[PDB]
């Protein structure tokens, strides 16, 4: 029993707006969280 567009539509209105609200924030905040994370907690290791 397919669908059509509004079951869904209401995930394709608020991640519309998702964007915008965290555009340009994606690659400074990583930044920091890059190298800590490579030393502490040590994801690989011997």
Same mark, same amino acid.
């Given at each position: 029993?397919?669908?059509?567009?509004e079951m869904?539509?209401?995930? *394709?209105?608020?991640?519309?707006?998702? *964007?915008?609200?965290?555009?340009?924030?994606?690659?400074?905040?990583?930044?920091?969280?890059?190298?800590?994370?490579?030393?502490?907690?040590?994801?690989?290791?011997?």
């Open positions: 029993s397919p669908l059509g567009e869904r539509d209401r995930a *394709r209105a608020h991640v519309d707006a998702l *964007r915008t609200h965290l555009a340009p924030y994606s690659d400074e905040l990583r930044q920091r969280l890059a190298a800590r994370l490579e030393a502490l907690k040590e994801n690989g290791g011997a």
